[model samples]
Target: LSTWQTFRRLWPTIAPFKAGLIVAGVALILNAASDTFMLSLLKPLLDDGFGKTDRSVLVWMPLVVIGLMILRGITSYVSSYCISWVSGKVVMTMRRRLFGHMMGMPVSFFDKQSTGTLLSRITYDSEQVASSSSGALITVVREGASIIGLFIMMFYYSWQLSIILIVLAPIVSIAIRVVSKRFRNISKNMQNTMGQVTTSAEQMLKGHKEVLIFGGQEVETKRFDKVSNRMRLQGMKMVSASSISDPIIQLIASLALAFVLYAASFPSVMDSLTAGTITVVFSSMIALMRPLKSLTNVNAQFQRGMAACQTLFTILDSEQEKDEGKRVIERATGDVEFRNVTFTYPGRDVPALRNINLKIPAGKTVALVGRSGSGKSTIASLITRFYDIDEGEILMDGHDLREYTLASLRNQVALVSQNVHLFNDTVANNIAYARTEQYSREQIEEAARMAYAMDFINKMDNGLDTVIGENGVLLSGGQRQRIAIARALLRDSPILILDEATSALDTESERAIQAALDELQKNRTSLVIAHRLSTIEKADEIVVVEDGVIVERGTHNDLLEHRGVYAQLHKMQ
Candidate 1:
């Protein structure tokens, strides 16, 4: 039942390429049949045509051999090409879908998984699948041409010789079983170690300056050495397993040949089997089983490939982000109500925000002031539906966040965090990223101007066309912050979230950008999370939070008069 269930799901994964697979199958059968018939003629060639001075047969025989070789080459090429192309297409398509789907998964999945391991799936694992795909073509060749052609030619010339190989079937099967067991253990450990090495290497390379400043070259080397050593040991074990099997297969073939030779003493067998027939049959069996021997020798490769495919499918089968409905709400109306909401971060022991209830109407800016470790960011994350609350619901415009399509919910809100990340794209693309298609060039420029980014962009060689470089390393903290704000402005959502958005800026930049921000937040509902009280003094309402609970709620003047935690912190800073 378990195997069938897996196959059922996997069936659709390759269903689109079935027509190509069928053509490959047909070509394989034809190639195998022709190869066998062509080789069998070697008996007649040697027995009478070549040895008995049969001049007519000698003249035409080389042409026949040449023609058969050409025929075999063409069919084999066609079949191999079809199968390989189909497999490559299947794997490439699967990678794109799998990667996009993986990105959409709830954040919980990433919390436990290493980025290097995920990347290995996209690179190492997918390549393993492609490698095995080449062998899948060979496996069909195993069944279609090699096995049948060898067995048929063997029985036709010498039944005695053929009988000896019947016992070989079980011996080879046992060898494969023993070898594969060792392979699976070594392969699994090797892949895990590879993930560790990749993760460490990636981190170290990205932060090379930190490593150099800290003088941690030896430390990084040791970490890589440990992972590399484990992989080396695993590979050695695989080699040990392969070394044990090769000699045994050779022994079996030799013994079978020996048995045939000894049995030739019998009158019926010895007289009927001519040297020409025996030579052709023996050579064919040897040619055919060489590939099988290769397969057996590389059993570890097959196991590793299967393991990778299983992992790739497992990621595809993970619980995906919710995107069920088609209802799209273009404008949120900025009216948000938390209905007995309770929430916890994934894998947390306790709720971060429990039994929460709050309301804010349109055209109002609410500032959430909290010390570190409070659930302010958690609340904002839930509002954007980055994750779902464990208990109760959050509603916008009287519609439950879950009822709307996931994209629609996210599209209606914009978040600007303290640490902003930019892709390796142009400044214009980065600014207009959130709502690219919706904003015209004029609108993009207007948004950039509003974020106070126009002057720096103009100084750039390509103006808006200047590339941000990887993760915006080419820009300063203040510059990255403005890019984030411009993106948010271009989005022009009904709800805005600013999580320490201006914290990175200098006083002058902060003040200048604050003017643009006030304009952006004019008619929208804003949730500003801040540690600096002065930043939120002009807010319509101030909500003080502590330890995941709303401790106080009122205007800034009211909170200052109470002389509570908010007042004490404000006074100290």
Candidate 2:
């Protein structure tokens, strides 16, 4: 997005804090005005107060200087505090919106993005945007006001010398324009590289145990250094571009100063210019340097901030999940069917699932048996509407899944997968996750008991209140898996999907959980995807899938007698 577009987009976020902005703006003006008023005193002090017996001029001059200083301090304090307050609010609002937008985005959005890149956008990019709004803005208004005030003072003394500085304005602006474009381009590359650096570091840190076990320390270090070096190079490019423009702009300003001094030296100019007038004009011209430098320098920061906003805006503008269905139901009947269903994941050339048909009647368990990548899990994912089918229909209770609101459709399904995810929260909270109302201790305990997790839970230091480390790193694989199962059990949705849910458990734990699962599956429609054939032996029906196609399907006894893919899978197990 262009800088103008970014500013327009950011207006709403900034507009609410206009009260603070107004206060800051007034203070900033006063602060700049005080500075110019101080420079104006230089002319009179040199003309009358110095060496002249004007006692009132000397006495009042010190008091007025003291008063201006006091005013400047108060204004500076007010502006600083107000700007910080507004900027803090803008940052908080941007972050909350970004996070909320991310949460509502489809799962496919996450599938295409790395966690680190998204993290960098929310944490780093948001801050850059905020600084642009508050930090760069303060420099522009405050320094801009000072420059304007000083220009008036210079012109008042002698318009001829002021005209010389005015002639250089277009040239300085042109230089700044070119430099700002370069700053923006470099800023974008730097932000992207920062995301990569974050991604590499996060990946290495998360897999530290694996890195150690595989003796990949040297390999990981080299890999990290590659991205780190790229980040350093990008940063140097930004700094170099920023550093170069300052000196070049300063050179142009210095040339303007030289012309003014040269003009003042001429007899015609010198005749009209008084000693105090020359001092004021020269001091004003010299004073112009700092604010001019500041204005030019702020362009780099402003452009960088604009670039960060562009990245963030792109995500915010991207199409969110289409939840256009108007239908809302408290609960579905738990009957799911796939009719001529075909699907391919985004950015894939080959289909993940072919034209196939399947049905899970209400209150029945259907086991899907297949080798890895044979589309067994794809079936489970489709049922949950994680990815929409490329063609054909997925029906839940005789209506297209799309016919139901996403929230209502998803409410009917509970998923327990092999790759379990648990937050760094108390054991009870983890099990009772995502519910609006709080669950009682007994209710949480009952779910834990059903998942065969209570045994380990009882042994923990804090029992149900014990905090699990990130993704339950402190827990054993079996313990984590059981917690996930307990969560699903607590959800108590009409449709339950156990996608290799028992894979992590020991045979003993698996057997104990199997009994509880059998009882739990009695009145719920269950889709069981498993490599272990024993776990699905008691399933109402067994369907064998291979290469994204349904090859054989029957009960355990019937499939064994048929001696097909299901029979072969049973024999292998």
Candidate 3:
């Protein structure tokens, strides 16, 4: 987006803090006026007070200048405080909006985005937007006002000499425009590279144990260095551009000053010049350099800020998960059927499930056995509606799944997968999770007991209140899986999915949890995706899938007798 277009979009976010911005703007103008007034005093002090014995000019001039400085200081403080206040609020509001938007995004959005990129958007991009909106505004207003005031003072002293500024204007403008464009392009690259840097570091940190055990330290280090070097190169480019622009601009101003000095030395010009007039014009022209430099420099910051805003706005504008179904239900009977369903994941050419048909009757258990990536887990995911199918229909309770509200549909299902996710929270809270207040202490304990997680929970530092580190890093794999199972048990939904839920457990733990899982599956529609054939031998029905197709369907005894895929899988196990 162009800078103006981005600003137009950002206006709504900044509008609420207009009162603070207005106050800051007014103070900045006063501060600029004070600066001009202070320099204006210099003319009278040099020509009247110092050139002659004027008592009033000497004593009152010092007093007036000091008083003006005091007023300038007050305005400076007010402007700084107000701008900072608005900047902080803008950042806070943007971050909250970004985070809330991310929560409502679909599973597909997350699949395409890295955790590090999202984290950088919230932590880094939002701040850049705020800085460009508020911080850049302050510099532009204050320095711009100061430049205008100084130019006016020069013109008042001598219009002929002030005309030199007109010649320098277009040159300075073109130079700044070229530099601003470069800054913007560089800033965008830097932002993207920063996200990569964050992603690299996060991946390494999360997989630190694997890296150590697999002797991948050198590989990871080289990967990290590549990203870090890119970041450093981008930084050096920004500094190089910024540093070059400043001196070039200063050099242009100095050349203008030199012309003014040459003109003043002419006999005709010297005859018309007075001690006061000559002093005011020269000082005003020299004073113009600082604000001019500041205004030029703020362009870099402004361009970067706009670039960051565009990045964040693109994410904010992305379509959230589609939830068009209006029918709401408190609960469902858990009769799920997939009829002629074909599903291909986003960005994939081949289908994950091809013309698949299956049924899970209410209050019954069905087992799915397949090799890795043969669409067994995809079946479970479809039941939860994580990804919509490309063709055909998924029915729940005899109605299409999309006919029911997403929340209502998902509320009826509880999923416990192999890769269990646990937050850094207490054991009781993790068991209760999102519905912490809804579950009583006894209910939490009962769920944990059923999952056989209380064995480790009771041994923790504070029992149910013990804080588990991030993703339950403080717990063993079996312990984390058990906690996930406990959470699912507490949910008590009608549709239960155990997608290799006991894969993380040892033989002893798996055997113990198998009993609890059997009891838990008694009155719910359970779809168990398992590699362990022993765990599914008691299921009411067994379906063997191969490469996106259901190749065999029967009971454990029937499949064993047939000696097909299920029997082959069973024999292999």
- Best candidate, TM-score: 3
Query: Model 1 clash pairs?
Result: none
Residue 351's C-alpha lDDT in candidate 3? 90
Any runs in candidate 2 off by more than 4 Å, and if so which? 1-9, 38-74, 158-277, 293-304, 307-311, 324-335, 424-426, 436-439, 459-462, 466-474, 501-515, 518-523
Model 2 pairs whose backbones collide: none
Candidate 1 Cα errors over 4 Å, as ranges = 1-19, 26-76, 96-134, 158-259, 291-340, 357-362, 391-409, 421-430, 460-462, 465-476, 501-515, 518-523, 555-560
lDDT of 3 at 443: 97
In model 3, how large is the Cα lDDT of residue 97?
88
Residues 94-195 of candidate 2: C-alpha lDDT, one tens digit per residue: 889889888988898888878988898889888878877687889999999998898888887777766766776667668667766776686687677678
Q: Lowest summed lDDT over 10 consecutive residues: which window, candidate 1?
A: 1-10
Select the stronger candidate by TM-score from 1 and 2: 2
Give a tens-digit lDDT track for model 1, residues 1-573: 243243345568667788877888778787777777787888879887878688688888888888888888887888888877877887788789889888888877887887888888887777677667557555645455656777788887776756655665557657656756765676677668667767866776787778888879898888778867876876787677567666666775566567667777568667667778777776876677666666564555555566667778888777878787678998788479887888888878787888777776687888888777788888888988877888897888888888889888888888776578888988888888745676688888998888887877899988898877765538766677778888887777888888765344778677656666676534589888866666678789888767767877888889899888778777876
lDDT of each: 0.75, 0.81, 0.81
Task: List the candidates' TM-scores in order.
Answer: 0.70, 0.74, 0.76
Quick one: how many clashes does candidate 2 have? 0
* Model 3 agreement with the true structure over 1-573: per-residue lDDT tens digits: 377677777788788889999999999999999998888888888888788788688879979988998999999999989988888888898888888998998888878877888888899888777877676788899889888888888777767666765676567668667766776676677678678777877887898877878868788889889877876887787677677767776776567568667876788656656878777777786688788777888878888888878778788878876799998766677478889999997778989899998998887888998888788888888888889988999988788877778888888888876567778888788888888888899999998887777888887778889888664546766666678788887887888888765344678777656666766534588888876776688789998888889988889999999989888778887
